[PDB]
Symmetry: C3
Subunit: 89 residues, 3 copies
């Protein structure tokens, strides 16, 4: 097993490509994304990204870049969970 | 960051509005939901047939309140599971 | 509450039934599965994927599922497997 951070970003669907680019530019080795619905504080259609990162710093870089650039104008939440990677490429 | 409980409810898709109502009434500030498939006990019920809710709560007690209400109201008649994970909130409205 | 391991497998959609069989054979009482997209190493393929979530009684059960899936399929198919802590509150 390898300890890891799992970064979750739930945000508006229109940001899909812009957030993917941020994720890639961070050095993250991959991400999972899915359509979801929800309600918060622009059911509404949303997207959820899950990104298992190398380090906490990598997760924080993604989170900061997304939130700073987009969260004043777009709905979203960002949170992190602990995960242990068992198998991967 | 702020520590939080992430409450997960996986249940029948037809309960979407009924569980949302309980979440809203609990004081929780939001939820995420998605369509899923799955198998469990495989007892007769009265993507595919399920929904999965994710609710980041204020407190553990709020999470438990949602869970307790859902289970008492619906889990005798409907499929489902409820669990909680730890999360840290980084950014939010 | 009952402590538990939540095993996550994200892999190719074609493997749905095959992985469900492994999960069932492990003694796991259930699983959740959903359609997702993603990208990774691009070793053998955004692509459409499936994500399983399996709450197991024990760590050993989680590991048995993970080991069987990875050995059987992950040389030849895309995927990742990871585990999170969970506490089960209610269930059938
Ligand atoms: N407390 C929460 N628990 C889980 N998901 C949440 C929570 N708060 C917000 N969300 C998710 O983030 C999305 C965006 O929330 P927010 O930015 O507050 O705006 P909105 O109410 O416009 O959806 C929600 O639709 C939901 O999917
Ligand atoms: N151990 C488990 N791990 C992950 N998901 C589970 C587990 N048990 C049940 N689930 C999820 O909860 C849903 C409801 O399970 P249950 O109430 O046992 O009845 P059913 O067999 O009709 O689906 C399952 O379809 C699955 O999505
Ligand atoms: N670091 C990561 N964070 C989240 N999801 C990941 C990560 N790396 C891989 N994944 C998920 O696993 C799937 C399979 O990954 P991989 O085997 O590297 O192949 P592919 O690049 O063909 O998708 C990815 O599509 C993605 O959904």
């Amino acid at each position: 097993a390898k300890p890891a951070n799992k970064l979750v970003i739930v945000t508006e669907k229109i940001l899909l490509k812009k957030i993917a680019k941020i994720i890639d530019e961070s050095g993250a080795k991959g991400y999972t994304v899915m359509n979801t619905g929800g309600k918060g504080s622009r059911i509404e259609a949303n997207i959820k990204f899950e990104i298992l990162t190398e380090t906490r710093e990598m997760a924080e870089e993604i989170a900061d870049r997304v939130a700073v650039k987009y969260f004043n104008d777009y709905a979203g939440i960002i949170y992190i969970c602990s995960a242990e990677v068992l198998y991967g490429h």
